[PDB]
Amino acid sequence: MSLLDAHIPQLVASQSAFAAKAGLMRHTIGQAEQAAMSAQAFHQGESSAAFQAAHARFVAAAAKVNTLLDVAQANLGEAAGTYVAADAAAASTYTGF
Amino acid sequence: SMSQIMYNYPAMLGHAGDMAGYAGTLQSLGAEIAVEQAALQSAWQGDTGITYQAWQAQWNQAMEDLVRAYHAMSSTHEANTMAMMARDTAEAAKWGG
């Protein structure tokens, strides 16, 4: 009464869905950032302080998502096997009162 | 106050599409990675850097600020009605100049 292949998965783990997800994240930002460009066609120049701050705020946070994506795969192992020895200042951060 | 400069009608000020969605898209995107890793918690080490508990909170705290970073530029969306004095939310609340 042995059940061989009845309700069992297949290529669900070996394929590693985690990795596919990690890469899907950057896709949302990469494509999203492009949209802000098309709209920036307003006058098309260079000067843009108000927008700069907002643009820097995004990249500043991305460091948290990216850094977390590496540790996740590194800690999970099966998730993925990669590294990014680039370092940065955001990795340190700081807090006051 | 700069309304008598060159702001006849709300041309740029206000909305112009669906930007709020682009940002929120990131939040939902990260949720997938947060729930995925939660299934491979037993696989997590913890003696490498970030822990399962720290990663969970950190991730959410990251995606949260990561999204707002995009809405920051779209903050002008509500700035439209701001022109009106009846409301006065950021004006009467402001204290610069």
Side-chain angles (χ1 to χ4, degrees), chain A residues 43-64:
Chain A
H43 292 150
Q44 223 176 125
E46 220 186 11
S47 320
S48 37
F51 172 86
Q52 169 130 21
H55 179 111
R57 277 181 166 181
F58 198 115
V59 51
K64 225 304 178 52

Side-chain angles (χ1 to χ4, degrees), chain B:
Chain B
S1 295
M2 267 142 80
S3 77
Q4 68 233 286
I5 311 303
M6 57 138 53
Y7 305 80
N8 253 75
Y9 259 55
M12 267 116 93
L13 217 70
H15 226 219
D18 296 282
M19 269 107 264
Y22 258 125
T25 299
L26 286 306
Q27 236 207 41
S28 200
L29 215 308
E32 284 285 4
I33 302 166
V35 63
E36 259 291 277
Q37 75 96 42
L40 322 169
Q41 294 271 262
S42 79
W44 197 278
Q45 306 283 285
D47 214 274
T48 38
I50 301 181
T51 341
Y52 62 92
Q53 57 97 350
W55 191 103
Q56 276 265 99
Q58 281 183 60
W59 183 262
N60 187 43
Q61 296 269 299
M63 306 298 302
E64 172 155 315
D65 191 6
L66 137 68
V67 184
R68 307 227 302 168
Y70 175 95
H71 217 264
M73 68 221 261
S74 98
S75 184
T76 341
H77 173 206
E78 288 201 278
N80 175 44
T81 319
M82 203 208 319
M84 215 180 231
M85 178 155 103
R87 254 73 229 280
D88 252 32
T89 51
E91 321 223 311
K94 245 161 230 273
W95 237 137

Side-chain angles (χ1 to χ4, degrees), chain A:
Chain A
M1 50 142 156
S2 173
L3 271 155
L4 275 165
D5 316 287
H7 213 144
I8 69 182
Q10 224 171 129
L11 278 300
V12 302
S14 278
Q15 266 294 275
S16 212
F18 204 85
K21 279 258 86 132
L24 221 152
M25 171 58 66
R26 234 139 171 288
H27 182 20
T28 318
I29 297 85
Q31 270 291 270
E33 283 279 358
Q34 197 150 56
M37 306 205 179
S38 81
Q40 216 155 311
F42 302 123
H43 292 150
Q44 223 176 125
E46 220 186 11
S47 320
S48 37
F51 172 86
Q52 169 130 21
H55 179 111
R57 277 181 166 181
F58 198 115
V59 51
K64 225 304 178 52
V65 189
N66 155 92
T67 299
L68 282 171
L69 272 177
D70 201 14
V71 297
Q73 300 160 329
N75 278 233
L76 290 181
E78 211 190 53
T82 188
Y83 86 88
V84 184
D87 221 300
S92 262
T93 342
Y94 61 93
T95 73
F97 242 85

